[PDB]
Amino acid sequence: QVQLVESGGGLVQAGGSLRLSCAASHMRWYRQREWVAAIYAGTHYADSVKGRFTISRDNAKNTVYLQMNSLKPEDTAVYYCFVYIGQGTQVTVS
Amino acid sequence: QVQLVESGGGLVQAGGSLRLSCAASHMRWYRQREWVAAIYAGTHYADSVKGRFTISRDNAKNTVYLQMNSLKPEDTAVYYCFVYIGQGTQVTVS
Amino acid sequence: QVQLVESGGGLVQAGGSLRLSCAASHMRWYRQREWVAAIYAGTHYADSVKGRFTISRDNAKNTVYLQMNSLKPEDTAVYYCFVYIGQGTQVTVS
Amino acid sequence: TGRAVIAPLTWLAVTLLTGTYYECAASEFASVDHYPMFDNVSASKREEILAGFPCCRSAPSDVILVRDEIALLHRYQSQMLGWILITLATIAALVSCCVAKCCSPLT
């Protein structure tokens, strides 16, 4: 009965900021599939995105927000959400 | 009942100065998590940030002040406070 | 009831001279932390700064003055006073 | 008996002189009340870091110097223990010979 829907996909130039909002109707974040971040307010990140991405959840909205900072074309992939596999959105950086 | 809030952050370019203030109702300063500085008036500084950082506290205001001079992009990270964990505020240098 | 405060620092170009004045209410000088000079009125200096620094004290003013000559950017550091540790002042040479 | 026990006593003396066994054995029993940096009011992270630093976790985060000191202390203590043991062993041997020269019916 719980479906993870992600929003915020599109095209963002290098060095910009994006917000990927996943709504849930202990979460994890993956990219393609490579693990990115894990949350419970303890947060964990891979060394590839350590100090770059920020993950925050709020029970008021039942949403998980990931902040993409210092984006580069090298990290062009599709981001998925995990608690059940999120459908995910493709983010392209030029 | 003691709440820690990080204040004085933001974005400062290279060569600038920044002041970090935390209100507490033996302190430690951290960045991400990397140990930064600790106090008793006796003070300690990490080798990676030695020669650059300064931490002071006053008992009257129950606040701890961190003095930061000639900042560089290498220290682009979110700073947390420790004694119970502070919220932490993101500080970026470009 | 005794407090140490440093004064006389600033930014001075290469080849110039600067005066350090410390107010106290047998003193040694430290830069950072490396020992610099000592006083009784006999004085002792370190080899790395020998021939450039001269320290004198006066009991009437109850203050210590250090003469630094032919300053260069290679010694850009904040200088502290030890009798208790002084707050210190930052000196930068271009 | 002496030839029987000469091997384990030599083993113990060498191990205590080396001190690495004493270091990896008595690290979790170190004292933290003297160090204000090791307060760790959570009462949980203190024991994990205490058990984890001696092994391979260098972590040069303004902590190594502290840990170095504790190691030295244990090493010093280790040596003392070994020395003490040897002394006691020697004394025991002597008194044993005394029994061999007191309770022996043979001339």
PDB file of all heavy atoms in Angstrom, chain C residues 27-63:
ATOM      1  N   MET C  27      59.106  36.692  30.889  1.00  0.00           N
ATOM      2  CA  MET C  27      58.072  36.468  29.891  1.00  0.00           C
ATOM      3  C   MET C  27      58.694  35.837  28.653  1.00  0.00           C
ATOM      4  O   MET C  27      59.851  36.106  28.315  1.00  0.00           O
ATOM      5  CB  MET C  27      57.370  37.777  29.499  1.00  0.00           C
ATOM      6  CG  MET C  27      56.697  38.526  30.644  1.00  0.00           C
ATOM      7  SD  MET C  27      55.725  37.509  31.766  1.00  0.00           S
ATOM      8  CE  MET C  27      54.521  38.704  32.341  1.00  0.00           C
ATOM      9  N   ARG C  28      57.913  34.999  27.972  1.00  0.00           N
ATOM     10  CA  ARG C  28      58.375  34.293  26.785  1.00  0.00           C
ATOM     11  C   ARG C  28      57.408  34.557  25.638  1.00  0.00           C
ATOM     12  O   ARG C  28      56.238  34.883  25.854  1.00  0.00           O
ATOM     13  CB  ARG C  28      58.494  32.764  26.992  1.00  0.00           C
ATOM     14  CG  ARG C  28      59.698  32.252  27.799  1.00  0.00           C
ATOM     15  CD  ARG C  28      59.708  32.777  29.226  1.00  0.00           C
ATOM     16  NE  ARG C  28      60.543  31.982  30.120  1.00  0.00           N
ATOM     17  CZ  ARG C  28      60.697  32.234  31.412  1.00  0.00           C
ATOM     18  NH1 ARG C  28      60.049  33.224  32.004  1.00  0.00           N
ATOM     19  NH2 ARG C  28      61.509  31.465  32.132  1.00  0.00           N
ATOM     20  N   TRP C  29      57.914  34.417  24.416  1.00  0.00           N
ATOM     21  CA  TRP C  29      57.145  34.641  23.199  1.00  0.00           C
ATOM     22  C   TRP C  29      56.960  33.342  22.425  1.00  0.00           C
ATOM     23  O   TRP C  29      57.895  32.545  22.294  1.00  0.00           O
ATOM     24  CB  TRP C  29      57.827  35.683  22.309  1.00  0.00           C
ATOM     25  CG  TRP C  29      57.442  37.092  22.626  1.00  0.00           C
ATOM     26  CD1 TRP C  29      58.176  38.015  23.312  1.00  0.00           C
ATOM     27  CD2 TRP C  29      56.240  37.757  22.221  1.00  0.00           C
ATOM     28  NE1 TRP C  29      57.492  39.205  23.383  1.00  0.00           N
ATOM     29  CE2 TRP C  29      56.303  39.074  22.716  1.00  0.00           C
ATOM     30  CE3 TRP C  29      55.112  37.363  21.495  1.00  0.00           C
ATOM     31  CZ2 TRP C  29      55.281  39.999  22.511  1.00  0.00           C
ATOM     32  CZ3 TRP C  29      54.099  38.280  21.291  1.00  0.00           C
ATOM     33  CH2 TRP C  29      54.190  39.582  21.798  1.00  0.00           C
ATOM     34  N   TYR C  30      55.742  33.134  21.923  1.00  0.00           N
ATOM     35  CA  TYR C  30      55.403  31.979  21.103  1.00  0.00           C
ATOM     36  C   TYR C  30      54.603  32.406  19.882  1.00  0.00           C
ATOM     37  O   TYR C  30      53.725  33.269  19.968  1.00  0.00           O
ATOM     38  CB  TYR C  30      54.609  30.934  21.898  1.00  0.00           C
ATOM     39  CG  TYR C  30      55.415  30.244  22.969  1.00  0.00           C
ATOM     40  CD1 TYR C  30      55.625  30.837  24.203  1.00  0.00           C
ATOM     41  CD2 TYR C  30      55.960  28.987  22.744  1.00  0.00           C
ATOM     42  CE1 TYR C  30      56.367  30.204  25.178  1.00  0.00           C
ATOM     43  CE2 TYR C  30      56.700  28.345  23.715  1.00  0.00           C
ATOM     44  CZ  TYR C  30      56.900  28.957  24.932  1.00  0.00           C
ATOM     45  OH  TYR C  30      57.636  28.320  25.904  1.00  0.00           O
ATOM     46  N   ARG C  31      54.912  31.779  18.751  1.00  0.00           N
ATOM     47  CA  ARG C  31      54.195  31.937  17.495  1.00  0.00           C
ATOM     48  C   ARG C  31      53.686  30.568  17.070  1.00  0.00           C
ATOM     49  O   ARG C  31      54.246  29.545  17.464  1.00  0.00           O
ATOM     50  CB  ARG C  31      55.105  32.542  16.419  1.00  0.00           C
ATOM     51  CG  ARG C  31      56.276  31.650  16.021  1.00  0.00           C
ATOM     52  CD  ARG C  31      57.133  32.302  14.945  1.00  0.00           C
ATOM     53  NE  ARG C  31      58.273  31.474  14.568  1.00  0.00           N
ATOM     54  CZ  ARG C  31      59.182  31.816  13.664  1.00  0.00           C
ATOM     55  NH1 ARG C  31      59.126  32.978  13.035  1.00  0.00           N
ATOM     56  NH2 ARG C  31      60.172  30.972  13.388  1.00  0.00           N
ATOM     57  N   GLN C  32      52.603  30.538  16.296  1.00  0.00           N
ATOM     58  CA  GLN C  32      52.006  29.242  15.976  1.00  0.00           C
ATOM     59  C   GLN C  32      51.642  29.113  14.497  1.00  0.00           C
ATOM     60  O   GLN C  32      51.220  30.074  13.858  1.00  0.00           O
ATOM     61  CB  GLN C  32      50.783  29.002  16.878  1.00  0.00           C
ATOM     62  CG  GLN C  32      49.750  27.973  16.407  1.00  0.00           C
ATOM     63  CD  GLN C  32      48.702  28.524  15.463  1.00  0.00           C
ATOM     64  OE1 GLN C  32      48.779  29.666  15.023  1.00  0.00           O
ATOM     65  NE2 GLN C  32      47.689  27.716  15.180  1.00  0.00           N
ATOM     66  N   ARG C  33      52.561  25.785  17.717  1.00  0.00           N
ATOM     67  CA  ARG C  33      53.135  26.765  18.631  1.00  0.00           C
ATOM     68  C   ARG C  33      54.647  26.585  18.738  1.00  0.00           C
ATOM     69  O   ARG C  33      55.125  25.568  19.241  1.00  0.00           O
ATOM     70  CB  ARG C  33      52.484  26.655  20.012  1.00  0.00           C
ATOM     71  CG  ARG C  33      53.023  27.641  21.037  1.00  0.00           C
ATOM     72  CD  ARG C  33      52.260  27.561  22.354  1.00  0.00           C
ATOM     73  NE  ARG C  33      50.887  28.040  22.232  1.00  0.00           N
ATOM     74  CZ  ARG C  33      49.826  27.255  22.110  1.00  0.00           C
ATOM     75  NH1 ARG C  33      49.937  25.937  22.096  1.00  0.00           N
ATOM     76  NH2 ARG C  33      48.620  27.808  22.002  1.00  0.00           N
ATOM     77  N   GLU C  34      55.397  27.577  18.261  1.00  0.00           N
ATOM     78  CA  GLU C  34      56.854  27.551  18.285  1.00  0.00           C
ATOM     79  C   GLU C  34      57.373  28.648  19.203  1.00  0.00           C
ATOM     80  O   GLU C  34      56.923  29.797  19.127  1.00  0.00           O
ATOM     81  CB  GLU C  34      57.466  27.715  16.883  1.00  0.00           C
ATOM     82  CG  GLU C  34      57.082  26.669  15.818  1.00  0.00           C
ATOM     83  CD  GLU C  34      55.619  26.680  15.401  1.00  0.00           C
ATOM     84  OE1 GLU C  34      54.846  27.521  15.894  1.00  0.00           O
ATOM     85  OE2 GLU C  34      55.247  25.858  14.538  1.00  0.00           O
ATOM     86  N   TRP C  35      58.315  28.284  20.069  1.00  0.00           N
ATOM     87  CA  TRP C  35      58.943  29.238  20.973  1.00  0.00           C
ATOM     88  C   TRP C  35      59.762  30.259  20.190  1.00  0.00           C
ATOM     89  O   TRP C  35      60.417  29.924  19.199  1.00  0.00           O
ATOM     90  CB  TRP C  35      59.827  28.492  21.970  1.00  0.00           C
ATOM     91  CG  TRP C  35      60.506  29.354  22.978  1.00  0.00           C
ATOM     92  CD1 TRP C  35      60.050  29.682  24.221  1.00  0.00           C
ATOM     93  CD2 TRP C  35      61.777  29.993  22.834  1.00  0.00           C
ATOM     94  NE1 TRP C  35      60.960  30.488  24.860  1.00  0.00           N
ATOM     95  CE2 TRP C  35      62.029  30.695  24.028  1.00  0.00           C
ATOM     96  CE3 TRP C  35      62.725  30.044  21.810  1.00  0.00           C
ATOM     97  CZ2 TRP C  35      63.190  31.437  24.225  1.00  0.00           C
ATOM     98  CZ3 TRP C  35      63.872  30.781  22.005  1.00  0.00           C
ATOM     99  CH2 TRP C  35      64.097  31.465  23.204  1.00  0.00           C
ATOM    100  N   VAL C  36      59.726  31.514  20.642  1.00  0.00           N
ATOM    101  CA  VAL C  36      60.371  32.602  19.913  1.00  0.00           C
ATOM    102  C   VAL C  36      61.509  33.208  20.727  1.00  0.00           C
ATOM    103  O   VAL C  36      62.671  33.168  20.309  1.00  0.00           O
ATOM    104  CB  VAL C  36      59.348  33.685  19.523  1.00  0.00           C
ATOM    105  CG1 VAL C  36      60.008  34.756  18.669  1.00  0.00           C
ATOM    106  CG2 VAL C  36      58.170  33.064  18.791  1.00  0.00           C
ATOM    107  N   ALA C  37      61.186  33.778  21.887  1.00  0.00           N
ATOM    108  CA  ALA C  37      62.181  34.486  22.681  1.00  0.00           C
ATOM    109  C   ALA C  37      61.785  34.454  24.150  1.00  0.00           C
ATOM    110  O   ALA C  37      60.630  34.198  24.497  1.00  0.00           O
ATOM    111  CB  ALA C  37      62.352  35.934  22.205  1.00  0.00           C
ATOM    112  N   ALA C  38      62.768  34.717  25.010  1.00  0.00           N
ATOM    113  CA  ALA C  38      62.569  34.739  26.452  1.00  0.00           C
ATOM    114  C   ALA C  38      63.276  35.949  27.043  1.00  0.00           C
ATOM    115  O   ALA C  38      64.226  36.477  26.462  1.00  0.00           O
ATOM    116  CB  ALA C  38      63.087  33.456  27.116  1.00  0.00           C
ATOM    117  N   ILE C  39      62.794  36.389  28.209  1.00  0.00           N
ATOM    118  CA  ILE C  39      63.378  37.512  28.930  1.00  0.00           C
ATOM    119  C   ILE C  39      63.442  37.160  30.411  1.00  0.00           C
ATOM    120  O   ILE C  39      62.750  36.260  30.891  1.00  0.00           O
ATOM    121  CB  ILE C  39      62.578  38.818  28.712  1.00  0.00           C
ATOM    122  CG1 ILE C  39      63.455  40.045  28.974  1.00  0.00           C
ATOM    123  CG2 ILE C  39      61.342  38.849  29.599  1.00  0.00           C
ATOM    124  CD1 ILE C  39      62.795  41.351  28.610  1.00  0.00           C
ATOM    125  N   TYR C  40      64.297  37.877  31.136  1.00  0.00           N
ATOM    126  CA  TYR C  40      64.431  37.677  32.575  1.00  0.00           C
ATOM    127  C   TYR C  40      63.497  38.642  33.299  1.00  0.00           C
ATOM    128  O   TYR C  40      62.922  38.310  34.335  1.00  0.00           O
ATOM    129  CB  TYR C  40      65.894  37.868  33.016  1.00  0.00           C
ATOM    130  CG  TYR C  40      66.120  38.068  34.507  1.00  0.00           C
ATOM    131  CD1 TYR C  40      66.547  37.013  35.305  1.00  0.00           C
ATOM    132  CD2 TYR C  40      65.915  39.303  35.116  1.00  0.00           C
ATOM    133  CE1 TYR C  40      66.757  37.177  36.661  1.00  0.00           C
ATOM    134  CE2 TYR C  40      66.124  39.476  36.473  1.00  0.00           C
ATOM    135  CZ  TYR C  40      66.546  38.410  37.239  1.00  0.00           C
ATOM    136  OH  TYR C  40      66.755  38.577  38.589  1.00  0.00           O
ATOM    137  N   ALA C  41      67.286  41.260  32.961  1.00  0.00           N
ATOM    138  CA  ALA C  41      66.846  41.691  31.640  1.00  0.00           C
ATOM    139  C   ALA C  41      67.532  40.879  30.546  1.00  0.00           C
ATOM    140  O   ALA C  41      67.438  41.211  29.364  1.00  0.00           O
ATOM    141  CB  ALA C  41      67.114  43.175  31.449  1.00  0.00           C
ATOM    142  N   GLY C  42      68.221  39.814  30.948  1.00  0.00           N
ATOM    143  CA  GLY C  42      68.852  38.942  29.978  1.00  0.00           C
ATOM    144  C   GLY C  42      67.826  38.210  29.134  1.00  0.00           C
ATOM    145  O   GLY C  42      66.753  37.831  29.599  1.00  0.00           O
ATOM    146  N   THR C  43      68.169  38.012  27.863  1.00  0.00           N
ATOM    147  CA  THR C  43      67.232  37.486  26.884  1.00  0.00           C
ATOM    148  C   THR C  43      67.849  36.313  26.134  1.00  0.00           C
ATOM    149  O   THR C  43      69.063  36.261  25.918  1.00  0.00           O
ATOM    150  CB  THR C  43      66.808  38.569  25.885  1.00  0.00           C
ATOM    151  OG1 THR C  43      67.968  39.091  25.225  1.00  0.00           O
ATOM    152  CG2 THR C  43      66.088  39.703  26.593  1.00  0.00           C
ATOM    153  N   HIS C  44      66.993  35.375  25.731  1.00  0.00           N
ATOM    154  CA  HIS C  44      67.403  34.204  24.968  1.00  0.00           C
ATOM    155  C   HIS C  44      66.516  34.065  23.739  1.00  0.00           C
ATOM    156  O   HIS C  44      65.294  34.225  23.823  1.00  0.00           O
ATOM    157  CB  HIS C  44      67.334  32.938  25.832  1.00  0.00           C
ATOM    158  CG  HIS C  44      67.754  33.158  27.253  1.00  0.00           C
ATOM    159  ND1 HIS C  44      68.962  33.731  27.590  1.00  0.00           N
ATOM    160  CD2 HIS C  44      67.124  32.896  28.422  1.00  0.00           C
ATOM    161  CE1 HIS C  44      69.061  33.805  28.904  1.00  0.00           C
ATOM    162  NE2 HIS C  44      67.959  33.305  29.434  1.00  0.00           N
ATOM    163  N   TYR C  45      67.141  33.773  22.596  1.00  0.00           N
ATOM    164  CA  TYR C  45      66.469  33.723  21.303  1.00  0.00           C
ATOM    165  C   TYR C  45      66.750  32.398  20.609  1.00  0.00           C
ATOM    166  O   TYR C  45      67.781  31.760  20.841  1.00  0.00           O
ATOM    167  CB  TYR C  45      66.901  34.870  20.346  1.00  0.00           C
ATOM    168  CG  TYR C  45      67.034  36.274  20.920  1.00  0.00           C
ATOM    169  CD1 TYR C  45      67.806  37.231  20.274  1.00  0.00           C
ATOM    170  CD2 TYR C  45      66.405  36.642  22.100  1.00  0.00           C
ATOM    171  CE1 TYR C  45      67.939  38.510  20.784  1.00  0.00           C
ATOM    172  CE2 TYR C  45      66.526  37.915  22.610  1.00  0.00           C
ATOM    173  CZ  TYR C  45      67.296  38.846  21.955  1.00  0.00           C
ATOM    174  OH  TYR C  45      67.417  40.116  22.473  1.00  0.00           O
ATOM    175  N   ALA C  46      65.817  31.998  19.747  1.00  0.00           N
ATOM    176  CA  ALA C  46      65.976  30.797  18.940  1.00  0.00           C
ATOM    177  C   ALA C  46      66.766  31.102  17.673  1.00  0.00           C
ATOM    178  O   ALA C  46      66.731  32.217  17.146  1.00  0.00           O
ATOM    179  CB  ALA C  46      64.613  30.209  18.574  1.00  0.00           C
ATOM    180  N   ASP C  47      67.478  30.084  17.180  1.00  0.00           N
ATOM    181  CA  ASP C  47      68.360  30.273  16.030  1.00  0.00           C
ATOM    182  C   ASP C  47      67.580  30.671  14.782  1.00  0.00           C
ATOM    183  O   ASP C  47      68.056  31.484  13.979  1.00  0.00           O
ATOM    184  CB  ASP C  47      69.166  29.001  15.773  1.00  0.00           C
ATOM    185  CG  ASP C  47      70.176  28.721  16.866  1.00  0.00           C
ATOM    186  OD1 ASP C  47      70.235  29.504  17.837  1.00  0.00           O
ATOM    187  OD2 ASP C  47      70.912  27.718  16.755  1.00  0.00           O
ATOM    188  N   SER C  48      66.387  30.099  14.592  1.00  0.00           N
ATOM    189  CA  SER C  48      65.607  30.393  13.393  1.00  0.00           C
ATOM    190  C   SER C  48      65.232  31.867  13.306  1.00  0.00           C
ATOM    191  O   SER C  48      65.048  32.395  12.203  1.00  0.00           O
ATOM    192  CB  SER C  48      64.349  29.524  13.359  1.00  0.00           C
ATOM    193  OG  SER C  48      63.319  30.146  12.612  1.00  0.00           O
ATOM    194  N   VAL C  49      65.117  32.547  14.446  1.00  0.00           N
ATOM    195  CA  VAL C  49      64.775  33.961  14.490  1.00  0.00           C
ATOM    196  C   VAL C  49      65.869  34.797  15.143  1.00  0.00           C
ATOM    197  O   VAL C  49      65.658  35.979  15.417  1.00  0.00           O
ATOM    198  CB  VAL C  49      63.424  34.187  15.198  1.00  0.00           C
ATOM    199  CG1 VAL C  49      62.308  33.466  14.458  1.00  0.00           C
ATOM    200  CG2 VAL C  49      63.500  33.725  16.645  1.00  0.00           C
ATOM    201  N   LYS C  50      67.033  34.208  15.402  1.00  0.00           N
ATOM    202  CA  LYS C  50      68.118  34.945  16.035  1.00  0.00           C
ATOM    203  C   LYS C  50      68.677  35.993  15.081  1.00  0.00           C
ATOM    204  O   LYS C  50      68.754  35.776  13.868  1.00  0.00           O
ATOM    205  CB  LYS C  50      69.226  33.989  16.478  1.00  0.00           C
ATOM    206  CG  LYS C  50      70.149  34.559  17.543  1.00  0.00           C
ATOM    207  CD  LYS C  50      71.100  33.497  18.073  1.00  0.00           C
ATOM    208  CE  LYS C  50      71.937  34.032  19.223  1.00  0.00           C
ATOM    209  NZ  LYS C  50      72.759  35.205  18.816  1.00  0.00           N
ATOM    210  N   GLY C  51      69.068  37.139  15.637  1.00  0.00           N
ATOM    211  CA  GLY C  51      69.568  38.241  14.845  1.00  0.00           C
ATOM    212  C   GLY C  51      68.503  39.126  14.236  1.00  0.00           C
ATOM    213  O   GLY C  51      68.848  40.097  13.548  1.00  0.00           O
ATOM    214  N   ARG C  52      67.229  38.825  14.461  1.00  0.00           N
ATOM    215  CA  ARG C  52      66.120  39.606  13.931  1.00  0.00           C
ATOM    216  C   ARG C  52      65.168  40.111  15.001  1.00  0.00           C
ATOM    217  O   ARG C  52      64.509  41.131  14.789  1.00  0.00           O
ATOM    218  CB  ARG C  52      65.319  38.771  12.919  1.00  0.00           C
ATOM    219  CG  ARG C  52      66.108  38.333  11.697  1.00  0.00           C
ATOM    220  CD  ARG C  52      65.402  37.196  10.976  1.00  0.00           C
ATOM    221  NE  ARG C  52      63.992  37.485  10.743  1.00  0.00           N
ATOM    222  CZ  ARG C  52      63.121  36.616  10.246  1.00  0.00           C
ATOM    223  NH1 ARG C  52      63.482  35.385   9.923  1.00  0.00           N
ATOM    224  NH2 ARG C  52      61.857  36.992  10.073  1.00  0.00           N
ATOM    225  N   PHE C  53      65.079  39.428  16.138  1.00  0.00           N
ATOM    226  CA  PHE C  53      64.119  39.737  17.186  1.00  0.00           C
ATOM    227  C   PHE C  53      64.847  40.178  18.450  1.00  0.00           C
ATOM    228  O   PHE C  53      65.814  39.538  18.873  1.00  0.00           O
ATOM    229  CB  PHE C  53      63.240  38.520  17.491  1.00  0.00           C
ATOM    230  CG  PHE C  53      62.165  38.266  16.467  1.00  0.00           C
ATOM    231  CD1 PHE C  53      62.490  38.016  15.142  1.00  0.00           C
ATOM    232  CD2 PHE C  53      60.831  38.239  16.838  1.00  0.00           C
ATOM    233  CE1 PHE C  53      61.502  37.774  14.204  1.00  0.00           C
ATOM    234  CE2 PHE C  53      59.842  37.988  15.906  1.00  0.00           C
ATOM    235  CZ  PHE C  53      60.177  37.760  14.588  1.00  0.00           C
ATOM    236  N   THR C  54      64.376  41.269  19.050  1.00  0.00           N
ATOM    237  CA  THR C  54      64.905  41.768  20.313  1.00  0.00           C
ATOM    238  C   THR C  54      63.742  42.091  21.238  1.00  0.00           C
ATOM    239  O   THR C  54      62.824  42.821  20.849  1.00  0.00           O
ATOM    240  CB  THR C  54      65.781  43.009  20.107  1.00  0.00           C
ATOM    241  OG1 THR C  54      66.874  42.688  19.239  1.00  0.00           O
ATOM    242  CG2 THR C  54      66.325  43.505  21.439  1.00  0.00           C
ATOM    243  N   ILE C  55      63.786  41.562  22.458  1.00  0.00           N
ATOM    244  CA  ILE C  55      62.698  41.695  23.420  1.00  0.00           C
ATOM    245  C   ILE C  55      63.207  42.454  24.637  1.00  0.00           C
ATOM    246  O   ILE C  55      64.269  42.130  25.182  1.00  0.00           O
ATOM    247  CB  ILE C  55      62.129  40.322  23.825  1.00  0.00           C
ATOM    248  CG1 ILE C  55      61.198  40.460  25.032  1.00  0.00           C
ATOM    249  CG2 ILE C  55      63.252  39.328  24.101  1.00  0.00           C
ATOM    250  CD1 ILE C  55      60.633  39.147  25.523  1.00  0.00           C
ATOM    251  N   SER C  56      62.454  43.471  25.053  1.00  0.00           N
ATOM    252  CA  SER C  56      62.759  44.245  26.246  1.00  0.00           C
ATOM    253  C   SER C  56      61.488  44.450  27.057  1.00  0.00           C
ATOM    254  O   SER C  56      60.386  44.523  26.506  1.00  0.00           O
ATOM    255  CB  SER C  56      63.381  45.603  25.897  1.00  0.00           C
ATOM    256  OG  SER C  56      63.565  46.393  27.058  1.00  0.00           O
ATOM    257  N   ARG C  57      61.651  44.543  28.375  1.00  0.00           N
ATOM    258  CA  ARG C  57      60.536  44.757  29.285  1.00  0.00           C
ATOM    259  C   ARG C  57      60.830  45.949  30.183  1.00  0.00           C
ATOM    260  O   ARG C  57      61.988  46.263  30.469  1.00  0.00           O
ATOM    261  CB  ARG C  57      60.256  43.514  30.149  1.00  0.00           C
ATOM    262  CG  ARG C  57      61.253  43.302  31.281  1.00  0.00           C
ATOM    263  CD  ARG C  57      60.724  42.326  32.320  1.00  0.00           C
ATOM    264  NE  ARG C  57      61.585  42.264  33.495  1.00  0.00           N
ATOM    265  CZ  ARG C  57      61.303  41.581  34.597  1.00  0.00           C
ATOM    266  NH1 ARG C  57      60.186  40.882  34.710  1.00  0.00           N
ATOM    267  NH2 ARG C  57      62.165  41.601  35.610  1.00  0.00           N
ATOM    268  N   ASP C  58      59.765  46.622  30.613  1.00  0.00           N
ATOM    269  CA  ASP C  58      59.861  47.716  31.568  1.00  0.00           C
ATOM    270  C   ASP C  58      58.899  47.467  32.720  1.00  0.00           C
ATOM    271  O   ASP C  58      57.715  47.195  32.502  1.00  0.00           O
ATOM    272  CB  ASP C  58      59.587  49.073  30.901  1.00  0.00           C
ATOM    273  CG  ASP C  58      58.415  49.036  29.934  1.00  0.00           C
ATOM    274  OD1 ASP C  58      57.596  48.098  30.000  1.00  0.00           O
ATOM    275  OD2 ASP C  58      58.317  49.959  29.099  1.00  0.00           O
ATOM    276  N   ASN C  59      59.420  47.543  33.948  1.00  0.00           N
ATOM    277  CA  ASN C  59      58.592  47.289  35.120  1.00  0.00           C
ATOM    278  C   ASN C  59      57.640  48.443  35.404  1.00  0.00           C
ATOM    279  O   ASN C  59      56.576  48.233  35.998  1.00  0.00           O
ATOM    280  CB  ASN C  59      59.477  47.020  36.339  1.00  0.00           C
ATOM    281  CG  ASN C  59      60.338  45.784  36.172  1.00  0.00           C
ATOM    282  OD1 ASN C  59      59.970  44.846  35.464  1.00  0.00           O
ATOM    283  ND2 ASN C  59      61.496  45.779  36.821  1.00  0.00           N
ATOM    284  N   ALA C  60      58.002  49.664  35.000  1.00  0.00           N
ATOM    285  CA  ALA C  60      57.136  50.812  35.248  1.00  0.00           C
ATOM    286  C   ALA C  60      55.814  50.683  34.501  1.00  0.00           C
ATOM    287  O   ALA C  60      54.743  50.905  35.077  1.00  0.00           O
ATOM    288  CB  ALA C  60      57.849  52.105  34.852  1.00  0.00           C
ATOM    289  N   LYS C  61      55.866  50.318  33.223  1.00  0.00           N
ATOM    290  CA  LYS C  61      54.658  50.097  32.443  1.00  0.00           C
ATOM    291  C   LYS C  61      54.089  48.699  32.639  1.00  0.00           C
ATOM    292  O   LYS C  61      52.930  48.461  32.281  1.00  0.00           O
ATOM    293  CB  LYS C  61      54.949  50.342  30.957  1.00  0.00           C
ATOM    294  CG  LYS C  61      55.420  51.760  30.656  1.00  0.00           C
ATOM    295  CD  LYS C  61      55.724  51.957  29.179  1.00  0.00           C
ATOM    296  CE  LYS C  61      56.190  53.375  28.884  1.00  0.00           C
ATOM    297  NZ  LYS C  61      55.162  54.391  29.231  1.00  0.00           N
ATOM    298  N   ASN C  62      54.877  47.791  33.219  1.00  0.00           N
ATOM    299  CA  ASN C  62      54.500  46.396  33.456  1.00  0.00           C
ATOM    300  C   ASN C  62      53.969  45.843  32.127  1.00  0.00           C
ATOM    301  O   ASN C  62      52.801  45.484  31.979  1.00  0.00           O
ATOM    302  CB  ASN C  62      53.508  46.299  34.637  1.00  0.00           C
ATOM    303  CG  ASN C  62      52.782  44.937  34.787  1.00  0.00           C
ATOM    304  OD1 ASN C  62      52.678  44.117  33.885  1.00  0.00           O
ATOM    305  ND2 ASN C  62      52.274  44.716  35.994  1.00  0.00           N
ATOM    306  N   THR C  63      54.802  45.963  31.096  1.00  0.00           N
ATOM    307  CA  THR C  63      54.516  45.500  29.747  1.00  0.00           C
ATOM    308  C   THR C  63      55.803  44.968  29.132  1.00  0.00           C
ATOM    309  O   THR C  63      56.906  45.329  29.550  1.00  0.00           O
ATOM    310  CB  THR C  63      53.940  46.619  28.861  1.00  0.00           C
ATOM    311  OG1 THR C  63      54.802  47.763  28.914  1.00  0.00           O
ATOM    312  CG2 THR C  63      52.533  47.013  29.294  1.00  0.00           C
TER     313      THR C  63
END
